[PDB]
């Protein structure tokens, strides 16, 4: 149901849809993409390392991310 591996088309859909997500979190990737929460956590970490989303809270159990600029 929810993807636990990421294919290349899912990876480019992440990098072309998570920018211009106004608010980004684990459940936001889980429901607006069709990935699971483990890839959602991994993708959040990877995308803030790249720097096109930027953090606000970075709590465990709840990460609030917004878009960069």
């Amino acid at each position: 149901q929810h993807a636990v591996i990421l294919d290349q088309e899912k990876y480019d859909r992440i990098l072309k849809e998570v920018p211009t997500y106004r608010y980004v979190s684990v459940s936001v990737l889980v429901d607006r993409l069709k990935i699971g929460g483990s890839l959602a956590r991994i993708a959040l970490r990877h995308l803030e390392k790249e720097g096109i989303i930027k953090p606000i809270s970075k709590h465990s159990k709840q990460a609030i991310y917004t878009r960069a600029t």
């Binding site: 636990v4 591996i5 990421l6 970490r45 990877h46």
Partner: protein
């Protein structure tokens, strides 16, 4: 101590040890669908097999599957410490065994029918369909079992 990324080339549902193991489940928890293999046993076998613990059981290599099967089937030869097993000090040969997928019901029937055969009290209760661990039968187990 730092985290680097990993790419997921995948295989679907996989027959392992005559049991359909589900890929898309992490390897410790995917191997727990095998009977005789619980969570502690899965974690210890996946640690003795040098298998990555984060490796989702369908992206696992066939030879890594084979090492997991060998350690599961012959655990005392991979330094699994023999207090960790299903059948220690067995009933008939004194050998520590860990009993796996289809053999757990077989050893369960061997234990129970040995216990019927000697006309022991617990085997009599198993034959009668009652609780065997000294439970009070007046109020509990009163719709099924």
């Amino acid at each position: 101590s730092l985290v680097v990324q990993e790419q997921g080339s995948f295989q679907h549902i996989l027959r392992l040890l005559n049991t359909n193991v589900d890929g898309n489940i992490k390897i410790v928890y995917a191997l727990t669908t095998i009977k005789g293999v619980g969570r502690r046993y899965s974690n210890l076998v996946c640690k003795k097999a040098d298998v990555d613990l984060h490796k989702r059981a369908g992206e696992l290599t066939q030879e890594e599957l084979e090492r997991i099967v060998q350690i599961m089937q012959n655990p005392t030869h991979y330094k699994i410490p023999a207090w960790f097993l299903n059948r220690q000090n067995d009933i008939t040969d004194g050998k520590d065994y860990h009993t796996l997928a289809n053999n757990v019901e077989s050893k369960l029937r061997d234990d129970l029918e040995r216990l019927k055969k000697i006309r022991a009290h617990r085997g009599i209760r198993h034959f009668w369909g009652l609780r065997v661990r000294g439970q009070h039968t007046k109020t509990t187990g009163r719709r099924r079992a």
